[PDB]
Scaffold this active site. Structure first.
Site, PDB file in Angstrom:
ATOM      1  N   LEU A  22      -6.043 -17.031  36.989  1.00 16.63           N
ATOM      2  CA  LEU A  22      -5.589 -16.978  38.382  1.00 16.63           C
ATOM      3  C   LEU A  22      -4.071 -16.954  38.435  1.00 16.63           C
ATOM      4  CD1 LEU A  22      -7.668 -19.944  40.033  1.00 16.63           C
ATOM      5  CD2 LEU A  22      -8.304 -17.494  40.227  1.00 16.63           C
ATOM      6  N   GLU A  30     -11.285 -25.392  46.226  1.00 16.34           N
ATOM      7  CA  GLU A  30     -11.477 -23.960  46.390  1.00 16.34           C
ATOM      8  C   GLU A  30     -12.534 -23.455  45.416  1.00 16.34           C
ATOM      9  OE1 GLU A  30     -11.693 -20.085  47.252  1.00 16.34           O
ATOM     10  OE2 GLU A  30     -10.911 -20.525  45.248  1.00 16.34           O
TER      11      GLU A  30
HETATM   12  N1  LIG Z   1      -8.945 -14.597  42.372  1.00  9.09           N
HETATM   13  C1  LIG Z   1     -10.239 -14.202  42.217  1.00  9.09           C
HETATM   14  O1  LIG Z   1     -11.185 -14.333  43.172  1.00  9.09           O
HETATM   15  C2  LIG Z   1     -10.780 -13.607  40.938  1.00  9.09           C
HETATM   16  C3  LIG Z   1      -9.898 -13.366  39.905  1.00  9.09           C
HETATM   17  N2  LIG Z   1     -10.273 -12.734  38.759  1.00  9.09           N
HETATM   18  C4  LIG Z   1      -9.187 -12.333  37.837  1.00  9.09           C
HETATM   19  O2  LIG Z   1      -9.144 -10.915  37.713  1.00  9.09           O
HETATM   20  C5  LIG Z   1      -8.965 -10.562  36.342  1.00  9.09           C
HETATM   21  C6  LIG Z   1     -10.215  -9.843  35.828  1.00  9.09           C
HETATM   22  O3  LIG Z   1     -10.535  -8.783  36.716  1.00  9.09           O
HETATM   23  P1  LIG Z   1     -10.287  -7.238  36.341  1.00  9.09           P
HETATM   24  O4  LIG Z   1      -9.119  -7.104  35.419  1.00  9.09           O
HETATM   25  O5  LIG Z   1     -10.243  -6.480  37.632  1.00  9.09           O
HETATM   26  O6  LIG Z   1     -11.608  -6.900  35.452  1.00  9.09           O
HETATM   27  P2  LIG Z   1     -13.185  -6.790  35.614  1.00  9.09           P
HETATM   28  O7  LIG Z   1     -13.778  -8.135  35.652  1.00  9.09           O
HETATM   29  O8  LIG Z   1     -13.614  -5.923  36.730  1.00  9.09           O
HETATM   30  O9  LIG Z   1     -13.601  -6.203  34.185  1.00  9.09           O
HETATM   31  C7  LIG Z   1     -13.295  -4.883  33.817  1.00  9.09           C
HETATM   32  C8  LIG Z   1     -14.437  -4.339  32.945  1.00  9.09           C
HETATM   33  O10 LIG Z   1     -15.700  -4.586  33.560  1.00  9.09           O
HETATM   34  C9  LIG Z   1     -16.525  -3.455  33.455  1.00  9.09           C
HETATM   35  N3  LIG Z   1     -16.696  -2.910  34.807  1.00  9.09           N
HETATM   36  C10 LIG Z   1     -15.904  -3.199  35.895  1.00  9.09           C
HETATM   37  N4  LIG Z   1     -16.405  -2.535  36.968  1.00  9.09           N
HETATM   38  C11 LIG Z   1     -17.495  -1.838  36.575  1.00  9.09           C
HETATM   39  C12 LIG Z   1     -18.369  -1.005  37.272  1.00  9.09           C
HETATM   40  N5  LIG Z   1     -18.490  -1.213  38.591  1.00  9.09           N
HETATM   41  N6  LIG Z   1     -19.409  -0.425  36.570  1.00  9.09           N
HETATM   42  C13 LIG Z   1     -19.603  -0.651  35.212  1.00  9.09           C
HETATM   43  N7  LIG Z   1     -18.729  -1.480  34.534  1.00  9.09           N
HETATM   44  C14 LIG Z   1     -17.697  -2.063  35.211  1.00  9.09           C
HETATM   45  C15 LIG Z   1     -15.830  -2.505  32.499  1.00  9.09           C
HETATM   46  O11 LIG Z   1     -16.209  -2.879  31.193  1.00  9.09           O
HETATM   47  P3  LIG Z   1     -16.345  -1.865  29.963  1.00  9.09           P
HETATM   48  O12 LIG Z   1     -14.957  -1.506  29.524  1.00  9.09           O
HETATM   49  O13 LIG Z   1     -17.057  -2.662  28.884  1.00  9.09           O
HETATM   50  O14 LIG Z   1     -17.182  -0.718  30.475  1.00  9.09           O
HETATM   51  C16 LIG Z   1     -14.375  -2.832  32.772  1.00  9.09           C
HETATM   52  O15 LIG Z   1     -13.493  -2.413  31.759  1.00  9.09           O
HETATM   53  C17 LIG Z   1      -8.669 -11.861  35.631  1.00  9.09           C
HETATM   54  O16 LIG Z   1      -7.285 -12.150  35.735  1.00  9.09           O
HETATM   55  C18 LIG Z   1      -9.397 -12.894  36.442  1.00  9.09           C
HETATM   56  O17 LIG Z   1      -8.849 -14.191  36.264  1.00  9.09           O
HETATM   57  C19 LIG Z   1     -11.531 -12.230  38.602  1.00  9.09           C
HETATM   58  C20 LIG Z   1     -12.472 -12.351  39.611  1.00  9.09           C
HETATM   59  C21 LIG Z   1     -12.153 -12.955  40.945  1.00  9.09           C
HETATM   60  C1  LIG Z   2     -11.176 -19.107  42.215  1.00  2.00           C
HETATM   61  C2  LIG Z   2     -12.134 -18.177  42.990  1.00  2.00           C
HETATM   62  N1  LIG Z   2     -12.336 -18.512  44.287  1.00  2.00           N
HETATM   63  C3  LIG Z   2     -13.145 -17.725  44.965  1.00  2.00           C
HETATM   64  N2  LIG Z   2     -13.335 -18.071  46.312  1.00  2.00           N
HETATM   65  N3  LIG Z   2     -13.799 -16.639  44.552  1.00  2.00           N
HETATM   66  C4  LIG Z   2     -13.634 -16.359  43.264  1.00  2.00           C
HETATM   67  N4  LIG Z   2     -14.342 -15.235  42.835  1.00  2.00           N
HETATM   68  C5  LIG Z   2     -12.780 -17.091  42.404  1.00  2.00           C
HETATM   69  C6  LIG Z   2     -12.510 -16.734  40.967  1.00  2.00           C
HETATM   70  C7  LIG Z   2     -13.362 -17.277  39.821  1.00  2.00           C
HETATM   71  B1  LIG Z   2     -13.817 -18.903  39.812  1.00  2.00           B
HETATM   72  B2  LIG Z   2     -15.336 -18.971  38.910  1.00  2.00           B
HETATM   73  B3  LIG Z   2     -15.018 -18.406  37.287  1.00  2.00           B
HETATM   74  B4  LIG Z   2     -13.815 -19.408  38.118  1.00  2.00           B
HETATM   75  B5  LIG Z   2     -13.285 -18.015  37.160  1.00  2.00           B
HETATM   76  B6  LIG Z   2     -14.477 -16.722  37.372  1.00  2.00           B
HETATM   77  B7  LIG Z   2     -15.753 -17.312  38.464  1.00  2.00           B
HETATM   78  B8  LIG Z   2     -15.006 -17.632  40.014  1.00  2.00           B
HETATM   79  B9  LIG Z   2     -14.509 -16.242  39.075  1.00  2.00           B
HETATM   80  C8  LIG Z   2     -13.062 -16.756  38.295  1.00  2.00           C
HETATM   81  B10 LIG Z   2     -12.558 -18.337  38.737  1.00  2.00           B
END
Ligand SMILES: NC(=O)C1=CN([C@@H]2O[C@H](COP(=O)(O)OP(=O)(O)OC[C@H]3O[C@@H](n4cnc5c(N)ncnc54)[C@H](OP(=O)(O)O)[C@@H]3O)[C@@H](O)[C@H]2O)C=CC1
Ligand SMILES: [C]C1=NC([N])=NC([N])=C1[C]C1234B567B89%10B%11%12%13B85%14B%1158B%12%11%15B%139%12B%1061B%12%112C5%153B%14874
Length: 186
Positions: A22, A30
């Site tokens: 994050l 959160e």
């Molecule tokens: N603040 C928040 O709510 C959240 C934050 N995060 C953050 O975001 C980052 C990770 O996200 P991001 O970099 O966007 O990566 P993703 O989690 O989307 O992963 C990317 C990989 O997932 C696979 N993939 C993604 N979309 C598809 C699709 N729809 N169909 C098939 N395969 C797919 C592919 O794998 P392959 O190459 O094997 O095909 C791709 O290279 C981290 O920093 C994490 O901490 C993540 C989720 C929520």
């Molecule tokens: C902080 C957050 N908050 C919200 N409202 N939605 C999200 N999608 C996330 C991001 C998340 B959390 B849990 B694990 B942990 B790691 B992975 B899973 B969830 B994904 C990342 B962090």
């Protein structure tokens, strides 16, 4: 599947990630909100399904994978089997949603929650039909290298409130944020 849900936390500059984590310090309540929303199902015999990309999967600490109490499905075009600990693997969202209706999962899945990252959100947000976006607005800028796609207000409506979601500004570790819920219908 007649409806989908997305859940994300985003900074003011639309950031969701930095260096595989994050952009902001961890916010406990959160996180607990994310857990409550994605885990809770009052339908006896069923669990919710979380769908995520591969990078998001490996961003979860090993000891916390799979996300407990939820069926964990990872999207990848390259993996042949789910990453260790994950329950299912699909090549696309549509493939993922079809999987839920085959015999193994037929009577097992309640709600479907998309939990990141950018490309999974982008696809989900354009999927036909009813979809809700549970968006936590982190009310500051943070340096980020991964961003949430733009919310199309021709499609999505900000709901004025939602049952079980707090309406007031929250604050943890000196960081203000608020919980929003958007919906589209077509
Ligand atoms: N603040 C928040 O709510 C959240 C934050 N995060 C953050 O975001 C980052 C990770 O996200 P991001 O970099 O966007 O990566 P993703 O989690 O989307 O992963 C990317 C990989 O997932 C696979 N993939 C993604 N979309 C598809 C699709 N729809 N169909 C098939 N395969 C797919 C592919 O794998 P392959 O190459 O094997 O095909 C791709 O290279 C981290 O920093 C994490 O901490 C993540 C989720 C929520
Ligand atoms: C902080 C957050 N908050 C919200 N409202 N939605 C999200 N999608 C996330 C991001 C998340 B959390 B849990 B694990 B942990 B790691 B992975 B899973 B969830 B994904 C990342 B962090």
């Amino acid at each position: 599947v007649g409806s989908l849900n997305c859940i994300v936390a985003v900074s003011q500059n639309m950031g969701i990630g930095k260096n595989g984590d994050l952009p902001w310090p961890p916010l406990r309540n959160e996180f607990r909100y994310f857990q409550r929303m994605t885990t809770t199902s009052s339908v006896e015999g069923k669990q919710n399904l979380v769908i995520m990309g591969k990078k998001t999967w490996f961003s979860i600490p090993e000891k916390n994978r799979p996300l407990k109490g939820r069926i964990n499905l990872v999207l990848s075009r390259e993996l042949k089997e789910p990453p260790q600990g994950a329950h299912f693997l699909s090549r696309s969202l549509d493939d993922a949603l079809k999987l839920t209706e085959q015999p193994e999962l037929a009577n097992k899945v309640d709600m479907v929650w998309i939990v990141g990252g950018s490309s999974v959100y982008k696809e989900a947000m354009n999927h036909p039909g009813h979809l809700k976006l549970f968006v936590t607005r982190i009310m500051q800028d943070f340096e980020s290298d991964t961003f949430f796609p733009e919310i199309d207000l021709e499609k999505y409506k900000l709901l004025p409130e939602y049952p079980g979601v707090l309406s007031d500004v929250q604050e943890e570790k000196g960081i203000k944020y608020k919980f929003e819920v958007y919906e589209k219908n077509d």
